[PDB]
Structures are given as C-alpha cells and as structure tokens.
Amino acid sequence: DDWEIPDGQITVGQRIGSGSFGTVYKGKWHGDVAVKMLNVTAPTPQQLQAFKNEVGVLRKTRHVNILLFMGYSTKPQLAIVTQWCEGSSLYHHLHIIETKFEMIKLIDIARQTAQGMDYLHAKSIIHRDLKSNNIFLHEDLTVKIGDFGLATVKSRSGSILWMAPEVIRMQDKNPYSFQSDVYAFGIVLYELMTGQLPYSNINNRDQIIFMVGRGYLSPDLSKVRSNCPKAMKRLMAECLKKKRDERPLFPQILASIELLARSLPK
Amino acid sequence: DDWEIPDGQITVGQRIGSGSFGTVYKGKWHGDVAVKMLNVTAPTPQQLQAFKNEVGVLRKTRHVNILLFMGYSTKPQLAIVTQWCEGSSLYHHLHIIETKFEMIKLIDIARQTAQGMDYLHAKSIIHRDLKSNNIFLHEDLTVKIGDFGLATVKSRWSGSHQFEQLSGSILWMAPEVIRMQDKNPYSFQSDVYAFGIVLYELMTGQLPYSNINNRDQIIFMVGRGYLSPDLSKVRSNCPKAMKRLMAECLKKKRDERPLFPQILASIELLARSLPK
Ligand SMILES: CCCS(=O)(=O)Nc1ccc(F)c(NC(=O)c2csc3c(N)ncnc23)c1F
C-alpha cells in the first residue's frame, strides 16, 4: 500500500520547472523519474495532512493517457514522483519548435487527449488547467496529461487562453465543471488545427480577459487549415460554446473524434 | 480508490488467450484494454475473497516497465483489466516473426526487463513465471512485464492450468524449481535464472536446448545439473561482459546468482561501452 518513498531512495538531478506550485526536477528511482518538489519548506500538519489527501486523488488514476503517478516524498521535502517522459510537451512541439504534424497525427493527439479526460471525468476529477503545456508527447507518440492534481493544496494567471468564460470572469466560488475542462480542450483543438495560440492579434491581456468573459471575443474558427475535416470545426465550435451547458461531455466528444477519424485516410 | 469496474462497462472483443485458466481478450474500456477472464465457472465465496486479495498485489505496482493494471471485474465473470499494448511479446518477436534486433536495442530490451524486475522485487513480489511471452514490447520499444498476477489463486484451484503452465516454462525454470525438492523453491534468484534465460534468448535469437526434442529428458537433466544453456551460441558481436552476466545469472547453484540492483548496474555499464 502506502506510496511513501523513504529518503535516500530518490536521486535528484537536472532542473526544469518554475513559478510556485513547485519545482520539477528529472530524477532517478528505479530508472529515470520526474520529481515535482513543492519546496513549501517545513510543514506542519494539517498542511501535511492535506498533501496526503491530495495524493489520494492521484492514486485513483490508472490510464495510458494519464501521467503515471509512481509515489510521493515527505521527508527531504513534500514531493510527487511520476514517470519521466521522453520527447517534448505539445505546447513545445506546436509553438516552440513548430513541429508540423501530419493531419492524421493531429487528430490522434486530440483523440488520446479526449480519451484521457473522459477517464479523468469518469473518475470524478476536474483538471482545471488543461492546456497544451500539460499535455505531453511521450516518445512523441503517446499522450500523457499532467498537472491535474493539487487543486486544494493550492487553495490552502497566464493560462487565461484556455479559460472558459465562466472561469475567466472570476465570478462565483467554483467555475470549474467538466464543461470548464471541455472548453479548455476546445482551445487545444483549435491549437492543433491551426498550430497557433488564439487571439494573437490582441496585445492586451486584460482586454482579452474582459471580452472572453463577456462573450464578445472568441477564437477564430476560420484559421483551421484546409486539410482539416469540416466536422472538426463543428466540434470545436461545440466545445467552445460560451454557455457551458451547450458544451458536450467527453464520451460524446470522444465519439465525434473517432467517427470523423476513420473517414479521413479512406 | 477501489478498482472494481461495474458490470457491462467493458467491451470484450478479439479472443487472444488460449489458456485453460481463462481467456485474454482485446477489450474496450476508456480505450483499448486487455481483459483476462478467469472463467473458473462462478465462485464460491470465498475464492472471491482471495481473488480480491490478488488485486491487492496488482495495485502495489506503478512502473513504466510493469504492465499497467487498470482494474478488475467480478460482475459478469471474474476479470483483470490492463492497458492494451500495441506491438507483440518478446517471444513472438524472437521466435514467431523472427525480428532481428539491433545489438543496441537488444541490450536495451534487457535493461528494461531488468529495470522492471528490480522494481517488481523491490516491492517483494516474485514473478514466478518470467519468460519472453510475458515481456511485452509496447510500441516496439518499451518492455511491459506481465502475467505475474494471480499467484495464490492459480496455486490453489482445481484444473490443468496448474499443470500446463508448469510445462509451459520448463525452459526458464531454475534447477531449484525443476526438482520439486520442497514446498517453496521460488525466489528472487529463480527469477534471476529465468531472466538469465531471456538473456540467452536475446543474444542467441533462440530458445535453449533446441536440439533436444524429448522434453521429459530436459527436466531430468537440468534438475540433475547435467544440462545447461550452450553459451557458445551468443552472436559473435555480443559484448563479452553480457556473456559473463549471462553465466553469472544462470548459475546452477542459486546463491551464486546476483540480484537485480547489481544486474542493472552491469547492463547499464555495458550499454555505455558500445555506440561511443
Ligand atoms: C499523476 C500526475 C500528478 S500531477 O501533480 O497532477 N502532475 C505532475 C506531478 C509531478 C510531476 F513531476 C509532473 N511533471 C511535470 O511537471 C513534468 C515537466 S517535464 C516532465 C517530463 N518530461 N516527464 C514527466 N513529468 C514532467 C506532473 F505533471
């Protein structure tokens, strides 16, 4: 049972992650691992207690498209250990190196991503930050969705682009529904289908923020490339719906992504 | 938490597992899965209870080189559900479709297999049936070790699954195991021995004792120590450290066999001694 990983066992190496929420280092623990060290130095329950509970959510995940939670540290620091992934994140492929994907592959990344989310949701987990930076291309073929945990350890800016309007207008207590995630997905669809971040012709974040939340600005669905199937535009539009209850849930989304997939190379 | 998958959620499809201890099917449940259905025709509380225990073992595993356990069913029949791997088993590649692997790749397959084994052991689980059919090459480049699951349940239900799967792996059995000298011959080391055999498979592209068609004799001879894998068949470009590690691994005397942490060190060492 308990995934406590006693000190001395994990070797820490090369560094990668910034901000708060933690620092991420590439590690070694029965092979190459990833270690996200929260660096929130010396808790102190019930801060300690909260982390143990946050871990509880992670252990509920077992899926090819969800990042493999392997264990957590308490001693050296508070930390979570996951599988390490070769290749780069989708945000990197698309908007940093500009890897041009074949239309067939693009549809597939989407396919897997929806696959993973459907799972997350079926297991009552709201990601609350689905974006192409948290979608990893492992060996550049398999999709691993990460950073969906530790909402709560953050309860006790700059992924605005994926925020649904209800989320964006920091309005009520909990904007986060499955459909909040669906909308974010929509944005990532638009990402794949146009190899671009939305609203790139507006240089004023607050303006984006204001408009998105009011439904005056929305992503420009006509920047999809020609070899992109008509039905993809139809689904993007469905996930991107400003009223949340107009958005499909994932199983239904999944269905559309499959149906339209095996009408493409034929 | 608890992993029981409620009825009729899973979609069974292609039959793949022959086997008299139930069938492996390619399934669908949140994407492609593998479903192994025990089809010992309806328990019997509490075989059921012990079954659930066996999952306790499976849940303990969370490693890239261990076939991802995804959940279990009891509802229609008893079942274990895992990720579906694309690609084929190491058995299939070596012996059925005769894939010639790059020397670098082969050593890598060894490493991973060793890697996963190390972990498997570092969680006090003995495989008891390591062979190249239980080493799966997902996407042709990641080893997922499977079929180490329902140890006790298998060890203790009426049927010829108790027989077949012993016969099914005489080649990988350590001597200690071959001569049923007592109740428990199975060890970290017997696993190391079987691993030593897959090492042979990888380097020789062959099963051992390929020129001894009488299988009853194999059992006698190996148990007595008159027979062991012919290590002069290692393809001429195999690093000579790997040929030594092989020997080290296959030691007839169990306690001369190194354990995985150390094996892993050797494999990683001889890796660095090849491309550069
Ligand atoms: C099961 C996921 C738990 S979580 O907290 O929701 N996500 C989560 C937890 C710990 C991590 F190190 C990471 N990983 C990363 O941030 C990360 C950055 S690069 C990278 C990589 N090449 N392989 C694995 N993980 C990462 C997570 F994505």
Ligand SMILES: CCCS(=O)(=O)Nc1ccc(F)c(NC(=O)c2csc3c(N)ncnc23)c1F
């Ligand atoms: C760690 C998993 C539990 S276990 O009992 O050790 N192994 C185990 C349990 C249920 C399965 F369907 C399988 N899978 C198979 O037998 C199997 C045959 S082909 C195949 C494949 N392409 N991908 C996954 N699994 C399999 C297992 F290997």
